C-alpha cells in the first residue's frame, strides 16, 4: 500500500493549494486526480481573487508570477437603466481590493510548485473509492493503468468538485442539500484582446446580462446570459460580439477590441450548499461542498477559505495533537459560505433578466440597483461583499 | 354651484393634512368624504411616523397633542433564529428617530383643527364623480341627502384611498399598475395594556411573523401573520394571546401584560404602485396612488411625502403663477415611493413565513437577517430606511 498523512482527491485549485500548504508545513500528502494535467489546465473558470486567496497563494509559496502578472482592481462598474455607476471598492471597503489573475494561471503555478517540491500527485487515478471513514485507518483505492492500488492515510480531503466521489462517499441521510438552479447560463468568450475597461463592467440590459472582464492587459473574458436551451455551436465569435455590443453602453461598445476566441463555453448558474461538510476522517472543500452562481466571483475564493480552515485545523491535529478541533471545520466554513452564497444570489437576482417576470419584479430589480448604488450604506454593503468578508479565527 | 380652489376627495389623513396645509397658506379647499366623521375615526391603522410626517403635522399647526403624547423611538428589535438584535436607529441613521403616535389620533387632531379653523368638509358626500379633468374648469358632483350638488375648482386632489373614485377617473390606458399580493395577512389586536417593550419587536418565528408595537404607555398593538383564508371570528382574544406568546422570546412572552381587545382585524398585505399619479387637473396622493405591506410602516409616511410635494407645487401655482411645475408631481413622488416600496418588500420578505418555501429560500432568509444585522453597513441600510430617506427638493 501507499501511505500518507492526508489523501487529497482532486488536483484542481482546492487540492493543489491544500497539498502545497501541507507539504510546506511538513504534513505528508498525496493528490489523486482522475484527469491528466493538460485536461485540468484546459479549464478557464475564475478571474477574480479576494485578498484572502492572494495571501494563501503567498503562504503556499506560489505567488511570484501572480505578483508580476496579477492586476489589482480598486473599483467595478454596474451599468443599468441607461446609467453607468462605479463602485469605489477601495474607498467603500475601508481600503481592500481584488486581484485579477486567471484560475488557469493559479493552477499552473501550483502544479509547477508541487512538481518542483517533489510532492506526490497521481494523475489518471481511475475509480477512486473511499473506505473506513469512521475509523482510525481510512484508505483510498484507485486504478492506475488498470492495476488497483491502495493509499492508507489518517484524513481525506474531498477536493474533487461538484461531481466528485467524495460527497457521494457520505450516506445521504447524514447530509442536507440546499440548491437553486437559475433559468439561464453564461456564454463566455476568452480572447487575446485588450480589455475594454481597466475595471469590470457588469451590465443589466433589457436583452439580458453581460459582463466585461479580463485576464491581463492583452487578454479579455466576456459573458452574456443565454437561455438554458442554448448550444455553444450556434454562437459564432461574430454572433457573440454583436450581442455583447447590443448589451453595453454605446461608448463602451464603440471602443471594444474584438478578436477570435481562445475558448467559448456555456456555464450553468447554480447555488448549492451541503451541511455538514465532513463525515468521520473525510472533509469536503470547494466545489465538492458548495457551488455559487458566478455573478459574485466567490467559488474559487470560498475554496480558498475552506482550504485555509482545513489546513489550520490539520496543523493543530498534527503539530499540537488537537485532532478534536477538526470537529469545528463545517461550522466555521459554513458561516462564510452562507454569506458568500447570499451575496452571489443577490448579484444574480439584480443583474439578470428572468423569464416570466411581472411588472412589480422588474421595478423592484431596478429600484434595488438605484438604492444600493445611490446610498453610501448600500454601496458599502456591495463593496465589503465584493472584496470578501473577513476570514474567521 | 359650490366654488373652491382645490377640491379634496377623502377626509382620511392625506386629505385632512393637504386641506390643513392649504387652508393655513390661504388656498381655498373643500374636502368631500363618503363616510361619517366617526366612521373615519374608527380605523386603527398606523403607529409609526417618520420625522417628515411629524414635521408636516407641525407645519399644518396640528402638533400640540403629538408633542405631549407621541413617543420617540431610538431603536427597534428583530428577533430571529433564537437571537434578539437591537438596531440602534439613532446611531446608525446619523441621529434620526421615529415617533409612535396612532393614525386615529393624527386624524382626530387634524379633524379638530379643521373644525376650529372653520374650513369646509362635507361628510356623507355620496356618488362623488370627477369631471372635465383636461380643462381649465374641472368640477366634482356629489349627492348630499339625495340632492345632487356641484363643486367647481381649479385642481382636484384624489385622497380617497385604495378603492377611491379618483384613480378610476383616469383612463386605464394612461396608467401602468405594479402590484404584488402577499400570501398572508396580519391579525391585529389593540388593547389598553402597557407595551411589553419600550421599542418595537419584529419576530421571524418558525410559526410565523409576530410584531409587538404600541400607541402609548397604556395602549399596545400586536400582530401575528395568518393565512389569507383566516376569519377574525375564529380568533378569540385568548387564542390571539396564546399564539403571540408562542412566537416571542420566552423572556418577552413571560412579561407580556394581556387584556381584552379594543379592536381586532385582519389586514391583507399588498404592494401597489400606479404610474403616473396625475391626469390633467387631478393629482392622486397616498393610498389612492400606492399601497405598501405594513411590515415597513411606510403608507401614512408616503401619504405625508405625496401631500408635502403636492402642497409645495400648489404654493408655486397659486403664489408664483408657476402652475407648469405641477407637471413634476408624479416624478418627484415616485422616486420616494419606489425606494419605500423596495424597503417594505424587503422587510416583508425577510420576516414572514411563506407557503411552499424550499430549503435554499429558508437559509437565504436566515442569512439575510444574519448579514444585515451583523454588518455596520447592513445595519446602516436598515436604519436609514426605517427612519425614512430624505424628502426631495
Ligand atoms: C464561468 C465561471 C467563472 C468563475 N469565476 C470565478 C471567479 O472569478 N472567482 C471565483 O472565486 N470563482 C470563480 N469560479 C468558480 C471556480 O472556478 C470554482 O469554484 C473552482 O474551480 C473550484 O475549485 P475546486 O478545486 O474545488 O474544484 P474543481 O476545479 O472542479 O477541481 C476538482 C478536481 O477533482 C477532479 N475529480 C473529480 N472527480 C474525481 C474523482 N472521482 N477522482 C479524482 N479526481 C476527481 C477533477 O478532475 C478536477 O480536476 C468560476 C467558475 C465558472 C464556471
Ligand atoms: C395594519 C396597518 C398598519 C399600518 N401601519 C402604518 C404605520 O405604522 N406607518 C405608516 O406610515 N402607515 C401605516 N399604515 C398605512 C396607513 O394607514 C395608510 O397608508 C393611510 O390610511 C393612508 O391614508 P389616506 O388618507 O391616503 O387613505 P385612507 O386612510 O384610506 O383615507 C381615504 C378616505 O377617502 C374616503 N373615500 C373613499 N372613497 C371615496 C369616495 N368615492 N368619495 C369620497 N370619499 C371617499 C374614505 O372613506 C377615507 O376616509 C398601516 C395600515 C394598516 C392597514
Ligand atoms: Br482562467
Ligand atoms: Br463563482
Ligand atoms: Br391607530
Ligand atoms: Br404601512
Automatic annotation (TrEMBL), chains A, B:
Pfam families reported for this sequence: FAD_binding_3
GO BP, one annotated term: benzoate catabolic process
Annotated GO MF terms: 4-hydroxybenzoate 3-monooxygenase activity; FAD binding
Annotated signal sequence range: none
Listed InterPro entries: FAD-bd, FAD/NAD-bd_sf, HB_mOase, RIFMO-like
Keywords carried by this UniProt record: FAD, Flavoprotein, Monooxygenase, Oxidoreductase
Gene3D superfamilies: D-Amino Acid Oxidase, subunit A, domain 2 (3.30.9.10), FAD/NAD(P)-binding domain (3.50.50.60)
FAD-binding domain mapped to chain residues: 3-344
EC number: 1.14.13.2
Membrane-spanning segments: none
Name of this protein: 4-hydroxybenzoate 3-monooxygenase
Protein species of origin: Pseudomonas aeruginosa
Amino acid at each position: 500500500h501507499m501511505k500518507t498523512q492526508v489523501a487529497i482527491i482532486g488536483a484542481g485549485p482546492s487540492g493543489l493549494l491544500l497539498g502545497q500548504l501541507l507539504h510546506k508545513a511538513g504534513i505528508d500528502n498525496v493528490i489523486l486526480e482522475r484527469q491528466t494535467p493538460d485536461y485540468v489546465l484546459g479549464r478557464i473558470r475564475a478571474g477574480v481573487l479576494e485578498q484572502g486567496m492572494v495571501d494563501l497563494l503567498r503562504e503556499a509559496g506560489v505567488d511570484r508570477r501572480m505578483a508580476r502578472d496579477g492586476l489589482v482592481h480598486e473599483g467595478v462598474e454596474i451599468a443599468f437603466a441607461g446609467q453607468r455607476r462605479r463602485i469605489d471598492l477601495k474607498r467603500l471597503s475601508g481600503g481592500k481590493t481584488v486581484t485579477v489573475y486567471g484560475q488557469t494561471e493559479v493552477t499552473r503555478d501550483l502544479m509547477e510548485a508541487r512538481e518542483a517540491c517533489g510532492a506526490t500527485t497521481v494523475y489518471q487515478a481511475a475509480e477512486v473509492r473511499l473506505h473506513d471513514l469512521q475509523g482510525e485507518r481510512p484508505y483510498v483505492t484507485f486504478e492506475r493503468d488498470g492495476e488497483r492500488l491502495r493509499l492508507d492515510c489518517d484524513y481525506i480531503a474531498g477536493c474533487d468538485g461538484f461531481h466528485g466521489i467524495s460527497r457521494q462517499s457520505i450516506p445521504a441521510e447524514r447530509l442536507k442539500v440546499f440548491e437553486r438552479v437559475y433559468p439561464f447560463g453564461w456564454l463566455g468568450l476568452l480572447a487575446d484582446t485588450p480589455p475594454v475597461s481597466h475595471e469590470l463592467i457588469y451590465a443589466n440590459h433589457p436583452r439580458g446580462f453581460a459582463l466585461c472582464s479580463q485576464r491581463s492587459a492583452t487578454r479579455s473574458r466576456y459573458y452574456v446570459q443565454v437561455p438554458l436551451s442554448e448550444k455553444v455551436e450556434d454562437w459564432s465569435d461574430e454572433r457573440f460580439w454583436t450581442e455583447l455590443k447590443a448589451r453595453l453602453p454605446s461608448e463602451v461598445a464603440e471602443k471594444l477590441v474584438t478578436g477570435p476566441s481562445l475558448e467559448k463555453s456555456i456555464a450553468p448558474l447554480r447555488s448549492f450548499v451541503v451541511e455538514p461538510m465532513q463525515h468521520g476522517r473525510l472533509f469536503l472543500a470547494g466545489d465538492a461542498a458548495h457551488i455559487v452562481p458566478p455573478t459574485g466571483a466567490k467559488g474559487l475564493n470560498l475554496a480558498a477559505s475552506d482550504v485555509s480552515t482545513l489546513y489550520r485545523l490539520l496543523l493543530k491535529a498534527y503539530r499540537e495533537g488537537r485532532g478534536e478541533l477538526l470537529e469545528r471545520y463545517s461550522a466555521i466554513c459554513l458561516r462564510r459560505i452562507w454569506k458568500a452564497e447570499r451575496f452571489s444570489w443577490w448579484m444574480t437576482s439584480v443583474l439578470h433578466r428572468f423569464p416570466d417576470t411581472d411588472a412589480f419584479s422588474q421595478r423592484i430589480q431596478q429600484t434595488e440597483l438605484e438604492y444600493y448604488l445611490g446610498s453610501e450604506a448600500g454601496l458599502a454593503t456591495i463593496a465589503e461583499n465584493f472584496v470578501g468578508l473577513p476570514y474567521e479565527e
